[PDB]
Amino acid sequence: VTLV
Amino acid sequence: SFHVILNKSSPEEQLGIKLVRRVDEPGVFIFNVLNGGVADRHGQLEENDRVLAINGHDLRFGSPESAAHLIQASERRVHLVVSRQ
Numbered sequence: 029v030t031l032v
Numbered sequence: 033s034f035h036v037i038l039n040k041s042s043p044e045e046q047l048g049i050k051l052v053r054r055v056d057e058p059g060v061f062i063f064n065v066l067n068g069g070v071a072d073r074h075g076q077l078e079e080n081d082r083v084l085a086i087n088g089h090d091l092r093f094g095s096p097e098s099a100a101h102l103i104q105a106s107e108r109r110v111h112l113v114v115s116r117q
Contacts (some may be wrong), residue, residue, distance in 0.1 A: 030096035
């Protein structure tokens with residue numbers, strides 16, 4: 029997952 | 033689609049959203065929304081929402097990495113165009  | 037505007041209190045502040053890609057379909061999708069973060073407090077975004085654009089930059093066939101970069105690039109305003117099934 030990519031945290032933004 | 034619909035519009036969600038989130039504002040960062042500082043340029044390095046995260047929105048508190050985890051984004052993912054899927055093997056079987058195009059798009060950037062919300063995996064989860066972190067409790068107490070900017071997106072959670074705003075309240076509108078839900079898991080599985082698709083991020084179609086950030087600040088006018090198309091992400092229909094884009095990547096979570098691009099989304100992160102675009103969110104970071106804004107001083108404050110993050111305008112998301114979102115779709116929901």
